[PDB]
């Protein structure tokens, strides 16, 4: 009947929760129906604009785990949604497009779709506002967490890559640069670059903040419906998985501890040296990358990978997890057998890139996979801005496993080695890795010395 | 929006990606096309060609299975002089250097050195430019188009060059071909119309500048097999070329090289009846060029499943009329191909 417009309102909310307002309304002229043919062959289709003169702003909670130590696995999502809701309020106040929340990290761009000339002002002013907001949360809930902020300006190419859990995002050498400069930013004060000071116009309390170890600075102040219900159901199963799609029907928010659960970060090692930006922004390198990520999103659609969830893809990194469909024990099944199938995913996706290396002539991709398992907390972030994501200790431990990983080999965590060892796989002891946040850690790579030795 | 007509004039463009290994003639052929359809550094890189050529000659004189000896060793100092300028990034190109290069180019031990140009890497426009630049020992001459087409400058990255042909747009992509460049190709595999795959047929008895241990033509065949099945190019026709015809002809009629010594399946190879050679064309050379055509067409036989067709031609990129004829035929074929969508 008329309810079709209701379902179209839902689908419009879904779009507006994965892509900026601008391109959300742009995709609401439905002239080119090639995405409509994505809903329903050589190169997968994707759209990526190479936009110059945009700012990037990252911000990580400082001392996050020290706060998330003993929350109720639900109050954590509560306070975190409060924080990012203040942050979104500030985004609209400051006219700057947020992009996503990488676990603890939160980041935005200053007008990539709709350019601006004051974008540096907009960006770092939002940074200062974020400092204010986290300071007020610090003395409102009484939590000892401030957040380090980093800003870098330049050119970024913004678009969508992937088929499963695709989200408007940004990529460059400048994005990664803002990332590291936040990583080198001392808490509470925005850590900016030469590239944004070169037109900051000194209207702020310029403070040349060296690293304690490219001329970075520091600042601190101064009928026909069935198609439509199909499309909306697909976009929703995109943005959030099935079980949460059920639980959210009846509940305002969502949150769930998972005492056992595995997570893998598959990062392509030698992308940034395959990506030569001399061409038209080199967005064709990102086209090849999207063609790759397509093969992992394809892997997801196998039968036996039902329980696997691609949480998101962070640039070249690919972040997957399991142990989320597991809601009841079965008599003839083993509990932690899911860690096998997820692990097999890892192996398979390794194999996948070798297929992509057959179609990649006189160059090879090399992805390192980091594997961990343990406790974690899954949650859903916003209202009218839906964003499924998981935190905990497995997330960061596996990310720092991968980031300390070796390519073409699966770096596994210790207790994961213990559990997997009985399941037939033969690991080889790597030694000891100094994991930021855990000190020395014992690690086991998967292939039994696949190289010579 | 002013973008509708822009997209529709895009859809009316023939994308001609130039592929194929290095020193094959992609840059030469695109220079040819722009000559047929369309500021002083050129003379300088021609002189760089001369210098690099003569240096490669004089250097390899010591590192063959016999060390090549000058028939007039009284010019030995000259050789030493040439070995002294071996790597001088800046150069004035003095007249005494040119006289040195010529006086060496006259010796016949130097000649026997050059004739063995297959056992070491060497540029293909050496013997030409030596003779042709002996004339331009002066300063106030600009070289003709023939000299500009035999100019050997290295290709490093996608060079997008446009041109029009009687109210048909054309946008081709000259590309490098050395091993270090072959990662750059897969950028421009997007909606490309035809893949002019250049090959150096006279490079069957030489080795590549990658490792001096792979037969240039065996390497070209491996690369053709690699891009023939390239899962992004299982729908795009490969308008094969077989460039460097005249060099091939001179090599075969020279009688010094043995293709059967380099490739065993030539002794038991027969001339095919579909031969369409021009009058006064040696049956041995014709059998050879068609043998190479068959070695390239076998790659396009065992696979493909009739989604993409290889349309081999023959060409000499430094023969403007040859490119004119073969590109008219190419224009027919890509008219039939681009519209296939
Ligand atoms: N005799 C003859 N020589 C040719 C012909 N085509 C190319 N050459 C010669 O071969 C050499 C290599 O040509 P070149 O222009 O460098 O190809 P390329 O595509 O640029 O090679 P690269 O840049 O990928 S390494 C040049 O010296 C050129 O003179 C031809 O048809 N006949
Ligand atoms: Mg070239």
Numbering used by the authors:
A (entry chain A): 320 to 359, 380 to 552, 566 to 574, 1020 to 1250
B (entry chain B): 28 to 65, 88 to 390
Reported in the publication:
To further structurally characterize the nucleotide-binding site of AC9, we determined the structure of AC91250–Gαs–M (the truncated AC91250 in complex with Gαs and MANT-GTP). Focused refinement of the 3D reconstruction improved the resolution of the map corresponding to the soluble part of the complex to 3.8 Å. As in the case of AC9–M and AC9–C4–M, the AC91250–Gαs–M map featured the density of the nucleotide extending towards the allosteric site. The density occupying the nucleotide-binding site observed in AC9–C4–M and AC91250–Gαs–M maps is consistent with a previously undescribed non-canonical pose of MANT-GTP, featuring the MANT-group stretching out towards the forskolin binding site. We propose that MANT-GTP in the absence of forskolin adopts a stable MANT-GTP pose “M2”, which is distinct from the M1 pose and is characterized by the MANT-group extending towards the forskolin site. Moreover, we could only obtain an activated state of the protein bound to Gαs upon removal of the C-terminal C2b domain. In the AC9–Gαs structures, this α4 helix is displaced further, with RMSD values of 3.15 Å in AC91250–Gαs–M and 5.7 Å in AC91250–Gαs–MF. However, this loop interacts with the Gαs protein, evident from the structure of the AC9–Gαs complex as well as the available AC5c1/AC2c2 crystal structures. Gαs as a full activator engages C1a and C2a domain simultaneously, whereas DARPin C4 as a partial activator only engages the C2a domain. This extensive interaction with the regions in both C1a and C2a domain of AC9 may contribute to higher potency of Gαs, compared to DARPin C4.
